[PDB]
mmCIF file of C-alpha atoms and ligand atoms in Angstrom:
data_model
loop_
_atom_site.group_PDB
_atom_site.id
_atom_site.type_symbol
_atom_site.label_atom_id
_atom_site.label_comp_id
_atom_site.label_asym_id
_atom_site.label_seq_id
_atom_site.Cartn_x
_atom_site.Cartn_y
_atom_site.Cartn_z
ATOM 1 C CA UNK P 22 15.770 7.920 -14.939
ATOM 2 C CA UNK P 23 17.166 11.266 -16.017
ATOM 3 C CA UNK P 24 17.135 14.658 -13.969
ATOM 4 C CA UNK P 25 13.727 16.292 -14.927
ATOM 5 C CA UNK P 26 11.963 12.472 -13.671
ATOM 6 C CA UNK P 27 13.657 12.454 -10.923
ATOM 7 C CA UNK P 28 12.486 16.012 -9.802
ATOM 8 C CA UNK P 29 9.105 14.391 -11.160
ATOM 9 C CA UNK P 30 9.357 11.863 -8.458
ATOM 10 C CA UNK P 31 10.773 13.756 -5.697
ATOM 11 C CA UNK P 32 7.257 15.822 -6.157
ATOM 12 C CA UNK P 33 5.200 12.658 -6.616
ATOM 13 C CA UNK P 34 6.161 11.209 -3.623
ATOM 14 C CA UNK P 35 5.881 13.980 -1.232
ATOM 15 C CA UNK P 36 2.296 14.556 -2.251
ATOM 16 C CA UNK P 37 1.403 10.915 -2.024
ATOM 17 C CA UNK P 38 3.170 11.129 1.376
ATOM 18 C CA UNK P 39 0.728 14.308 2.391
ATOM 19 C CA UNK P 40 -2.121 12.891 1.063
ATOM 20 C CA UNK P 41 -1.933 9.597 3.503
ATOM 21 C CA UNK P 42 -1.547 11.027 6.611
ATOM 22 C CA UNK P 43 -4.597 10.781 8.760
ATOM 23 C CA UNK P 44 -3.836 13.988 10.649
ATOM 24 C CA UNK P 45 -1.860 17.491 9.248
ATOM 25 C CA UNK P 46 1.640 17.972 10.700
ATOM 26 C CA UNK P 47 0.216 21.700 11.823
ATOM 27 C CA UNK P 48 -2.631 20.059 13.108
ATOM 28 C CA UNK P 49 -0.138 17.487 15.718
ATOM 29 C CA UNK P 50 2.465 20.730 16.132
ATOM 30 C CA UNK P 51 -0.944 23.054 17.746
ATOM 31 C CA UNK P 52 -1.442 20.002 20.098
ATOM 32 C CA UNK P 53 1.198 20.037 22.064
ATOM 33 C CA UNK P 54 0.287 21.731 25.337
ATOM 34 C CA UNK P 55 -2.768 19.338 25.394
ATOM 35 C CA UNK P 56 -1.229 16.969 27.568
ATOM 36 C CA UNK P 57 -2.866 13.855 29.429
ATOM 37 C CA UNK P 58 -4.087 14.739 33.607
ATOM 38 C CA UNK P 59 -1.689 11.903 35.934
ATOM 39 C CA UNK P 60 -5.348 11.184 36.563
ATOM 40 C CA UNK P 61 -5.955 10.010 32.946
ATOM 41 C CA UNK P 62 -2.566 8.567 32.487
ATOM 42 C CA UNK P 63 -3.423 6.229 35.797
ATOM 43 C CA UNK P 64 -6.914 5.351 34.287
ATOM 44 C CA UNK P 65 -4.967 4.193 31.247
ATOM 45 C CA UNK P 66 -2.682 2.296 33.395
ATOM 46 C CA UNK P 67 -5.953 0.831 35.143
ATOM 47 C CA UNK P 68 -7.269 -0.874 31.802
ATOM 48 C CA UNK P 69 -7.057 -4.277 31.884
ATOM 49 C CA UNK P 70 -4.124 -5.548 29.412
ATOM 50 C CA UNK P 71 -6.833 -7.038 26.766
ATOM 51 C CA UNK P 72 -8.681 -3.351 26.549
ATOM 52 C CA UNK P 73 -5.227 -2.160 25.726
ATOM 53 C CA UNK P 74 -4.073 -4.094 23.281
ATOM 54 C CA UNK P 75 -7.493 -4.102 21.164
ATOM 55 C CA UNK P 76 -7.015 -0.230 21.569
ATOM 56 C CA UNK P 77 -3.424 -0.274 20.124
ATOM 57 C CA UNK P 78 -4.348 -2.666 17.271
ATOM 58 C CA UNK P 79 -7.207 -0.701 16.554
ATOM 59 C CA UNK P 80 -5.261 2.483 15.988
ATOM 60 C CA UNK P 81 -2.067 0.409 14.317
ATOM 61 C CA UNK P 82 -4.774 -1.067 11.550
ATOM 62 C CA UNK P 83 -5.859 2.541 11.099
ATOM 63 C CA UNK P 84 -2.336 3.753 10.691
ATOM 64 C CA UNK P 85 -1.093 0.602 8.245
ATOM 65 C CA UNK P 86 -4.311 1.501 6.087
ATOM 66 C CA UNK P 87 -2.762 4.836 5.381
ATOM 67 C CA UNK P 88 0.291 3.545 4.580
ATOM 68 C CA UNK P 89 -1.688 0.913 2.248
ATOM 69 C CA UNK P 90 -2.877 3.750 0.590
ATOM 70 C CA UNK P 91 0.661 5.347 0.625
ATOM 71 C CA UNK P 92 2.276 2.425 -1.197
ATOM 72 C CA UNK P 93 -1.197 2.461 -4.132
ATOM 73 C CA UNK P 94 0.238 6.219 -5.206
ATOM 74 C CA UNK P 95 3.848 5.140 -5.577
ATOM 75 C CA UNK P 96 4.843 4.846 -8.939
ATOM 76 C CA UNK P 97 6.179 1.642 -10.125
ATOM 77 C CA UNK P 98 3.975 -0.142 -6.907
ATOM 78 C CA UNK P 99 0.735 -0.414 -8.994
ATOM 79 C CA UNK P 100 2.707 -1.957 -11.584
ATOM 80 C CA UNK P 101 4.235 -4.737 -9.948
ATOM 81 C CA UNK P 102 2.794 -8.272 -9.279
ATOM 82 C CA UNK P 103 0.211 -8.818 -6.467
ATOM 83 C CA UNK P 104 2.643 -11.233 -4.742
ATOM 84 C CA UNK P 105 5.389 -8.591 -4.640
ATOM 85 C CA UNK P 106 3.189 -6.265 -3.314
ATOM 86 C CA UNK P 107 1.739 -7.933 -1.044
ATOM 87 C CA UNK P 108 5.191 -9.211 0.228
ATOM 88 C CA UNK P 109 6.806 -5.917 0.167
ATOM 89 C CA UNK P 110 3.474 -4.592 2.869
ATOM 90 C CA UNK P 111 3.934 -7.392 5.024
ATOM 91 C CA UNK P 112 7.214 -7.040 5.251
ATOM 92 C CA UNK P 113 7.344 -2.983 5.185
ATOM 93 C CA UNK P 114 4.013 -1.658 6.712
ATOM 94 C CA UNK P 115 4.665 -1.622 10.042
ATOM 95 C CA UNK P 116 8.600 -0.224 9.267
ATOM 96 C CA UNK P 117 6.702 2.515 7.582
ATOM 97 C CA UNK P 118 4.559 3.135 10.603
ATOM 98 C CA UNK P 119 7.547 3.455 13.118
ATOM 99 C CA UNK P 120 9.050 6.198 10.659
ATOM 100 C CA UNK P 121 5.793 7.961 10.354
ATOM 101 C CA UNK P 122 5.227 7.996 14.265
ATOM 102 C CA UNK P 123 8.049 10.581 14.962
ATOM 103 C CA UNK P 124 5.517 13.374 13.172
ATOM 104 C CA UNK P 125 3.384 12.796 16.271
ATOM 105 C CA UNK P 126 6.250 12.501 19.276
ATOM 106 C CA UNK P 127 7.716 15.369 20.877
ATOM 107 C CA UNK P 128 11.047 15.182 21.746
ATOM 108 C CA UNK P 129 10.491 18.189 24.040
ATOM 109 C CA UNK P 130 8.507 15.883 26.733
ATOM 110 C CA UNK P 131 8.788 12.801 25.466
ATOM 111 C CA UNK P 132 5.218 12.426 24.551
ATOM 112 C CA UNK P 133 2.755 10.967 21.433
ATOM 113 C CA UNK P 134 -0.098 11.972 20.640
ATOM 114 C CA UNK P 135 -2.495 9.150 21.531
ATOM 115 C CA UNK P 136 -6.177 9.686 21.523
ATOM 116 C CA UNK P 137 -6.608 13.262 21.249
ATOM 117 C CA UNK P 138 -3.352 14.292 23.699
ATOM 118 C CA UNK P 139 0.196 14.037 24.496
ATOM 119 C CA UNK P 140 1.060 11.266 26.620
ATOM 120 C CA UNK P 141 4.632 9.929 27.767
ATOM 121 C CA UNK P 142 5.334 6.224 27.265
ATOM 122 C CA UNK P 143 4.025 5.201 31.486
ATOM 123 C CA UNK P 144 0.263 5.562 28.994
ATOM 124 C CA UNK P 145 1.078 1.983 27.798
ATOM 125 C CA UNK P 146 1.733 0.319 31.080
ATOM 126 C CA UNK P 147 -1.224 -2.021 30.927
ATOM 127 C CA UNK P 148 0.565 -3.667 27.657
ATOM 128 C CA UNK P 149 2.942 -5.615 29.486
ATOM 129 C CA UNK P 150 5.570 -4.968 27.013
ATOM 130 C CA UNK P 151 7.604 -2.188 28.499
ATOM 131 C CA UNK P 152 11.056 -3.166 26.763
ATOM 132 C CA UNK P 153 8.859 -2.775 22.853
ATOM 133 C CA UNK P 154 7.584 0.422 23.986
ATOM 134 C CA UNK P 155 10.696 2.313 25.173
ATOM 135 C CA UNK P 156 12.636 0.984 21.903
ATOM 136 C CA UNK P 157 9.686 2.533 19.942
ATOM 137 C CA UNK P 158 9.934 5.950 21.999
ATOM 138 C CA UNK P 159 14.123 5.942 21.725
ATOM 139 C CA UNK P 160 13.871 5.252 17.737
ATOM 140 C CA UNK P 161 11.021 8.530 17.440
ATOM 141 C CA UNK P 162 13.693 10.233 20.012
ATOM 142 C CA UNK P 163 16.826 9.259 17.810
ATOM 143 C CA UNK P 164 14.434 10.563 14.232
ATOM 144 C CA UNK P 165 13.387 13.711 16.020
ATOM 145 C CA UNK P 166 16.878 15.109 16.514
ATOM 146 C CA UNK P 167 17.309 14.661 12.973
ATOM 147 C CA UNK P 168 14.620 17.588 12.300
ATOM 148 C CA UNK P 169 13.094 15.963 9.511
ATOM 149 C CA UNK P 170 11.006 17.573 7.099
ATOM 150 C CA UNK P 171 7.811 16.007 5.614
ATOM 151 C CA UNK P 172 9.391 15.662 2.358
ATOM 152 C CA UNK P 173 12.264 13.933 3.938
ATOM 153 C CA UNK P 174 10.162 11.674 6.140
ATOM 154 C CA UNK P 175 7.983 10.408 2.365
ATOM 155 C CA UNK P 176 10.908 9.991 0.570
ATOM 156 C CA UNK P 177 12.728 7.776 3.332
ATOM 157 C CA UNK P 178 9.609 5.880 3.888
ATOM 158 C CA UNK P 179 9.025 5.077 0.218
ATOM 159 C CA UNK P 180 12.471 3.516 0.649
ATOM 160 C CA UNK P 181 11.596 1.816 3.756
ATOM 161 C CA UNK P 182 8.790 -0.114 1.389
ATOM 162 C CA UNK P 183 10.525 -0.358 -1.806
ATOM 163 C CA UNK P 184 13.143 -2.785 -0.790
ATOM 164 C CA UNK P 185 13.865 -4.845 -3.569
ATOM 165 C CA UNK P 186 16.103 -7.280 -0.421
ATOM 166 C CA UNK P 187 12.764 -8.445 0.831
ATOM 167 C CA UNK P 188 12.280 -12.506 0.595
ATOM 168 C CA UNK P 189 10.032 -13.787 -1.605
ATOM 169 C CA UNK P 190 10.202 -10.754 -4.267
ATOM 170 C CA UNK P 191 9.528 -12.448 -7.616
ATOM 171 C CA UNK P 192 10.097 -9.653 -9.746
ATOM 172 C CA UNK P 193 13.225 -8.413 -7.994
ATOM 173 C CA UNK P 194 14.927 -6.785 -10.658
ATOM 174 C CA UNK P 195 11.831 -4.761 -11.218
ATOM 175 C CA UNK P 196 11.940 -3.575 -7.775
ATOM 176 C CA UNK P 197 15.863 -2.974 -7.509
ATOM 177 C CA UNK P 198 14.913 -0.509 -10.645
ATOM 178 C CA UNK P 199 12.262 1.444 -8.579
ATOM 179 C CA UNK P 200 14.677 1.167 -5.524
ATOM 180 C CA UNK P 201 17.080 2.502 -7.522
ATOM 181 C CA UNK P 202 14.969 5.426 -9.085
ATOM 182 C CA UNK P 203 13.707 6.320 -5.448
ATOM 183 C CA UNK P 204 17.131 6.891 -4.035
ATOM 184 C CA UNK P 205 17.901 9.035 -6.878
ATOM 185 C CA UNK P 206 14.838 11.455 -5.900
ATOM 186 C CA UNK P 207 16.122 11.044 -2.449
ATOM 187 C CA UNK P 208 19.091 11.640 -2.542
ATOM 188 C CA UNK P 209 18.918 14.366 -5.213
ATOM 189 C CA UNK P 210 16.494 15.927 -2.623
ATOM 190 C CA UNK P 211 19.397 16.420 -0.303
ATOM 191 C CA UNK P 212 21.335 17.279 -2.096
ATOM 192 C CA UNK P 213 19.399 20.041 -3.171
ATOM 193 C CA UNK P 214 18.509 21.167 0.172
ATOM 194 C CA UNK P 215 22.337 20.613 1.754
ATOM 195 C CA UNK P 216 20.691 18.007 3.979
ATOM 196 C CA UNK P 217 23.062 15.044 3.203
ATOM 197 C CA UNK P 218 24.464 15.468 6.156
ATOM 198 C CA UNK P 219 21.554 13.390 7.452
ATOM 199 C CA UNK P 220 22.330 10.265 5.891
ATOM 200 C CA UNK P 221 25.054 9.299 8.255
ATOM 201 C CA UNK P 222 22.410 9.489 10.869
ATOM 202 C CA UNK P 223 19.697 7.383 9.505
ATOM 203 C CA UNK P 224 18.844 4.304 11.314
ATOM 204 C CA UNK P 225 21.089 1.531 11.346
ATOM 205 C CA UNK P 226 19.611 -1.351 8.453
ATOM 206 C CA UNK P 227 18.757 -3.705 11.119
ATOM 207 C CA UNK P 228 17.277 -1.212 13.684
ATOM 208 C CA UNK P 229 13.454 -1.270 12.171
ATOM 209 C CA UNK P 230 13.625 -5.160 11.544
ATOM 210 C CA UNK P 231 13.966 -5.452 15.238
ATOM 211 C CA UNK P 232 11.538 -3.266 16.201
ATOM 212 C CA UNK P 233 9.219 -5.400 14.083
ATOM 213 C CA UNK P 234 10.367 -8.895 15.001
ATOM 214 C CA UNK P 235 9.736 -7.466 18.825
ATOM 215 C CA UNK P 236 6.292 -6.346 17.731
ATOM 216 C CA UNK P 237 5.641 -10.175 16.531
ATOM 217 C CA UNK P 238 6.865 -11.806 19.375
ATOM 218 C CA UNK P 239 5.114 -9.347 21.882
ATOM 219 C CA UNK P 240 1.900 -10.169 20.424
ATOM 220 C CA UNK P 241 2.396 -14.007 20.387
ATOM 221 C CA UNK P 242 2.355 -13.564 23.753
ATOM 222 C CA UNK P 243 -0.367 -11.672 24.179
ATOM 223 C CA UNK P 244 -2.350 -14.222 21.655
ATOM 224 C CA UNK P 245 -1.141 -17.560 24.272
ATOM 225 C CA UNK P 246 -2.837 -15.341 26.402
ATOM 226 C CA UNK P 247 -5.841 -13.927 25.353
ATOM 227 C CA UNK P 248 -6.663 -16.303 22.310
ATOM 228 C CA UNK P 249 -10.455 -15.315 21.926
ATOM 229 C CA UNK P 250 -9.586 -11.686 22.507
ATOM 230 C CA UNK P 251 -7.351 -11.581 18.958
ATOM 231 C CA UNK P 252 -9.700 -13.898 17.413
ATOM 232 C CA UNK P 253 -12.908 -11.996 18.169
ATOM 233 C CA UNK P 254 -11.589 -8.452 19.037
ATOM 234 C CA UNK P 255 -8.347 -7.956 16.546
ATOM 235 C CA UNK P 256 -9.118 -6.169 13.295
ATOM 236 C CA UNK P 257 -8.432 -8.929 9.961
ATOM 237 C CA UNK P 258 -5.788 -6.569 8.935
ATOM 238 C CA UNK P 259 -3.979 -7.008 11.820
ATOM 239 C CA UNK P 260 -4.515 -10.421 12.211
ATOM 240 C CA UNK P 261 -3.137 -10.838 8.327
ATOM 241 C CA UNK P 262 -0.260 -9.009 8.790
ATOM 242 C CA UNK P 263 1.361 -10.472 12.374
ATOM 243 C CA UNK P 264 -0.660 -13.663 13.040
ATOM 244 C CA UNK P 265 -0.895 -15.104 9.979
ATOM 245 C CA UNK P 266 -4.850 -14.728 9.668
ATOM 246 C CA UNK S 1 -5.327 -16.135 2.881
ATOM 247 C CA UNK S 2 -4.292 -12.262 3.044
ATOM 248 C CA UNK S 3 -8.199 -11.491 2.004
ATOM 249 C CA UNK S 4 -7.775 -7.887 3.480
ATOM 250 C CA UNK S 5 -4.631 -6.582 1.713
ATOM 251 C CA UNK S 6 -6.217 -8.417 -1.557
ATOM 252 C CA UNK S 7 -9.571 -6.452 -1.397
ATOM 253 C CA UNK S 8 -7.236 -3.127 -0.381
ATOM 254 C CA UNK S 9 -4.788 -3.602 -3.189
ATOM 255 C CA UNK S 10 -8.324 -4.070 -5.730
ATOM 256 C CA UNK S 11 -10.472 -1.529 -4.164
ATOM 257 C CA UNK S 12 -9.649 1.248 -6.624
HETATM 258 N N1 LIG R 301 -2.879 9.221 17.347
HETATM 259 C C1 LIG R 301 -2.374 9.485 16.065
HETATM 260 C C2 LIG R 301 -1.124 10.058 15.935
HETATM 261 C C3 LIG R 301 -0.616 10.341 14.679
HETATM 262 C C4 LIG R 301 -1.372 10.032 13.565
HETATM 263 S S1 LIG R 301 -0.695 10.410 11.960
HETATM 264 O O1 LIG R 301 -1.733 11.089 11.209
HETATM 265 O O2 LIG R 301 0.573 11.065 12.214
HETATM 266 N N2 LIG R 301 -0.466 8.919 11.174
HETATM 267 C C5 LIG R 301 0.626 8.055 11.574
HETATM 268 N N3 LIG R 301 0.742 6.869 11.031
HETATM 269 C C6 LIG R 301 1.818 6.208 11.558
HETATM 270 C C7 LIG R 301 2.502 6.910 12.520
HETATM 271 S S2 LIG R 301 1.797 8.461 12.753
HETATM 272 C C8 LIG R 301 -2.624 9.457 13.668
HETATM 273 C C9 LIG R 301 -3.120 9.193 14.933
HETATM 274 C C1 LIG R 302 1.816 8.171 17.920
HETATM 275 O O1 LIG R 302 2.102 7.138 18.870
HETATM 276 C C2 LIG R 302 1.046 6.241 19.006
HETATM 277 C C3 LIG R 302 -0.209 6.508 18.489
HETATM 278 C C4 LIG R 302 -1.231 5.590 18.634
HETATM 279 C C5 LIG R 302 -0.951 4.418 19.293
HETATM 280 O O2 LIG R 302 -1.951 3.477 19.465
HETATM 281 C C6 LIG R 302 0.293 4.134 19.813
HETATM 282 N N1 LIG R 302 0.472 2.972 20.451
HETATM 283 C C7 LIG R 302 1.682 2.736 20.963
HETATM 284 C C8 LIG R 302 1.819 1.412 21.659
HETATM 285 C C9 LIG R 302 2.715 3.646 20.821
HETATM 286 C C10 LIG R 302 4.082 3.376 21.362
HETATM 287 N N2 LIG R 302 2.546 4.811 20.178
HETATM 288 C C11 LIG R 302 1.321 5.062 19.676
HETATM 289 O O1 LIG R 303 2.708 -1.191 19.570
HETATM 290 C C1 LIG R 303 3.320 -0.846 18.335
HETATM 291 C C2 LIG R 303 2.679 0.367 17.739
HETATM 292 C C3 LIG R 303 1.319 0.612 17.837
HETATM 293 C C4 LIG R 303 0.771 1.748 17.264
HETATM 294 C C5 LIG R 303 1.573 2.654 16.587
HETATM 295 C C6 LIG R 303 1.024 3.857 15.995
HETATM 296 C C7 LIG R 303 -0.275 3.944 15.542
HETATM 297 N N1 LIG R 303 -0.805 5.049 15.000
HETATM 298 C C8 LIG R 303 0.009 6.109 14.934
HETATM 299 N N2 LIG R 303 1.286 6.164 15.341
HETATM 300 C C9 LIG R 303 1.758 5.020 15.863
HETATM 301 C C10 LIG R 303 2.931 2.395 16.493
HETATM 302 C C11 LIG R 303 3.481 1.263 17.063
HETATM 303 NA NA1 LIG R 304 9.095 14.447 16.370
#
């Protein structure tokens, strides 16, 4: 693509990326003193470890539907097979979610914002997977010092998706060409705005893969478990994206 | 099999 396409995209994507968030950036930012009691944090901790779970894969589906819609206004996505796409959500959803996620943590406190207020990572007790959630908190810790900006974070996560090294791409060349185009905008971006300084600093390739493959294993656990709980009380998407259906 | 994303990736 040549220079005026590339600014093209740059715009593209961080509109796409603005129009897909559930909640405003201003709106999480004028939040932040509304903080959870230690009363509410040990009611949380109270809930049995099935209530929690449903909760948290509600609010995941939610969040993966956004990105869903994220991936729809990307150029080049629409244009691709349904396989590829469909591999390239599976695989790249939930690594989209995990980038998107530092917009609502604040380094300050350590806190998210999880239904309605800001809440440190003792909110997800009840889970039973302690070592997934502080990985998740230390990777929105290790982003936040960055400073991104929104731009930044919509251009990074349309890279995080558009990974033509995904198994089971069969269009691959197609997608190493909009792979290609995007780090262009990206990068151009940067450049533009003396960021690349940043791009030592970006997660390790490996880092969100783990996160994920945690995520899986977590929940087969959980499933062993509570087997009628996912079956009855886990939303399809969810189910189609980590359990196979 | 992946009925969800399929009716998501339709739904226009
Ligand atoms: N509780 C809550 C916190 C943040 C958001 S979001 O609008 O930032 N969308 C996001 N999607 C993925 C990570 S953040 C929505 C709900
Ligand atoms: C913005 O941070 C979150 C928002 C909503 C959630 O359900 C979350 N659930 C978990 C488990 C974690 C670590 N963070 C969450
Ligand atoms: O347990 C993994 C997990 C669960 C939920 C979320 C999430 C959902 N909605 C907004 N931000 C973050 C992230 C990771
Ligand atoms: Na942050």
């Amino acid at each position: 693509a040549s220079l005026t396409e590339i600014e093209h995209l740059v715009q593209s994507v961080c509109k796409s990326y603005r129009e897909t968030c559930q909640l405003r950036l201003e709106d999480l930012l004028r939040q932040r003193s509304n903080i959870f009691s230690r009363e509410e944090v040990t009611g949380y901790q109270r809930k049995s470890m099935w209530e929690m779970w449903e909760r948290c894969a509600h609010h995941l589906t939610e969040a993966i539907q956004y990105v869903v819609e994220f991936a729809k206004r990307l150029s080049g996505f629409m244009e691709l097979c349904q396989n590829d796409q469909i591999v390239l959500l599976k695989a790249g959803a939930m690594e989209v979610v995990l980038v998107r996620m530092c917009r609502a943590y604040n380094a300050d406190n350590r806190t998210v914002f999880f239904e309605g207020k800001y809440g440190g990572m003792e909110l997800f007790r009840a889970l039973g997977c302690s070592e997934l959630i502080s990985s998740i908190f230390d990777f929105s810790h290790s982003l936040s010092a960055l400073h991104f900006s929104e731009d930044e974070i919509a251009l990074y996560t349309a890279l995080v998706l558009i990974n033509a090294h995904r198994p089971g791409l069969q269009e691959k060349r197609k997608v190493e060409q909009l792979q290609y185009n995007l780090e262009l905008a990206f990068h151009h971006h940067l450049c533009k705005t003396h960021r690349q300084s940043i791009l030592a600093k970006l997660p390790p390739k490996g880092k969100l893969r783990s996160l994920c493959s945690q995520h899986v294993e977590r929940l087969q656990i959980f499933q062993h478990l509570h087997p009628i709980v996912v079956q009855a009380a886990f939303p399809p998407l969810y189910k189609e994206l980590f359990s196979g259906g | 099999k992946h009925k969800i994303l399929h009716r998501l990736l339709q739904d226009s």
